[PDB]
Amino acid sequence: DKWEMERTDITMKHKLGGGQYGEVYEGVWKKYSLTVAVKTLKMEVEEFLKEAAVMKEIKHPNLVQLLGVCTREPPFYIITEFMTYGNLLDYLRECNRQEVNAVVLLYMATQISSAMEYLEKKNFIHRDLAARNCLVGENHLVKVADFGLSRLMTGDTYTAHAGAKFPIKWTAPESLAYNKFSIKSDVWAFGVLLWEIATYGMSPYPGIDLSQVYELLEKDYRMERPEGCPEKVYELMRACWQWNPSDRPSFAEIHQAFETMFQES
């Protein structure tokens, strides 16, 4: 299609993110002197190509934009825009908090919830929402990584494969116990993502043993309000962490609430 590209069009450079994202490289699109992110294969081939095909249908200012693909012959490339400031987790931990202050945190949360509202409306789920999977550009622009998206008609449930291992401290209770994922489990992870943002990148449930997280959640244990976090933001967190998925707000409601708060600041 129009996305296909010749691998010669790209000159590879350093592997990025310390390898934590797999085979992803900083690259140059020589035609436009553009620094890009190149993703290569070295997961199964068919899942790689599906994840490229899904990104062709994705267009939102806060979702990482696909730019091209090399799918005809190996090695296969997925080429996306390059976000200058890396992932949101490292960005928050290393930032100047006088610059990245409370209103900027609200701005970043409004952007992320806008991307998730779009996915909610387009019948997609993310399944790995976390600060490490958000990217930061110039002027506190935030985009959600959209490489593990799955199709799921909003309101249905996806059952992860047997033996799947999850980031426990970001994972909804129905997913920990029954491997069931939905847009509501993305809302749960967003609440944890909210907590990461309000703490400038602290690890959630600090010091708590991973084996006991689920049993704590069963007895209505939830993370405490971070220092300096507005109560209205913390109550949005707690709504995302409701035990019953149907009681969690939609991303549309979440984005509306953040849009209102952001405009009032």
UniProtKB/Swiss-Prot annotation:
DNA damage-induced activation of ABL1 requires the function of ATM and Ser-211 phosphorylation. Polyubiquitinated. Polyubiquitination of ABL1 leads to degradation. ATP binds at residues 16-24, 39, 81-87. The modification Phosphotyrosine is found at Y21, Y25, Y158, Y178. A motif (Kinase activation loop) lies at residues 146-170. The active site is at D128. The modification Phosphoserine is found at S211. Widely expressed. Residues 10-258 form the Protein kinase domain. It is found in: Cytoplasm, Cytoskeleton; Nucleus; Mitochondrion. Changing A102T: In CHDSKM; increases kinase activity; no effect on protein levels. It comes from the Eukaryota. It is linked to Leukemia, chronic myeloid: A clonal myeloproliferative disorder of a pluripotent stem cell with a specific cytogenetic abnormality, the Philadelphia chromosome (Ph), involving myeloid, erythroid, megakaryocytic, B-lymphoid, and sometimes T-lymphoid cells, but not marrow fibroblasts. Belongs to the protein kinase superfamily. Tyr protein kinase family. ABL subfamily. Interacts with SORBS1 following insulin stimulation. Found in a trimolecular complex containing CDK5 and CABLES1. Interacts with CABLES1 and PSTPIP1. Interacts with ZDHHC16, ITGB1 and HCK. Interacts with STX17; probably phosphorylates STX17. Interacts with INPPL1/SHIP2. Interacts with ABI1, ABI2, BCR, CRK, FGR, FYN, HCK, LYN, PSMA7 RAD9A, RAD51, RAD52, TP73 and WASF3. Non-receptor tyrosine-protein kinase that plays a role in many key processes linked to cell growth and survival such as cytoskeleton remodeling in response to extracellular stimuli, cell motility and adhesion, receptor endocytosis, autophagy, DNA damage response and apoptosis. Coordinates actin remodeling through tyrosine phosphorylation of proteins controlling cytoskeleton dynamics like WASF3 (involved in branch formation); ANXA1 (involved in membrane anchoring); DBN1, DBNL, CTTN, RAPH1 and ENAH (involved in signaling); or MAPT and PXN (microtubule-binding proteins). This is Tyrosine-protein kinase ABL1. It comes from Homo sapiens (Human).
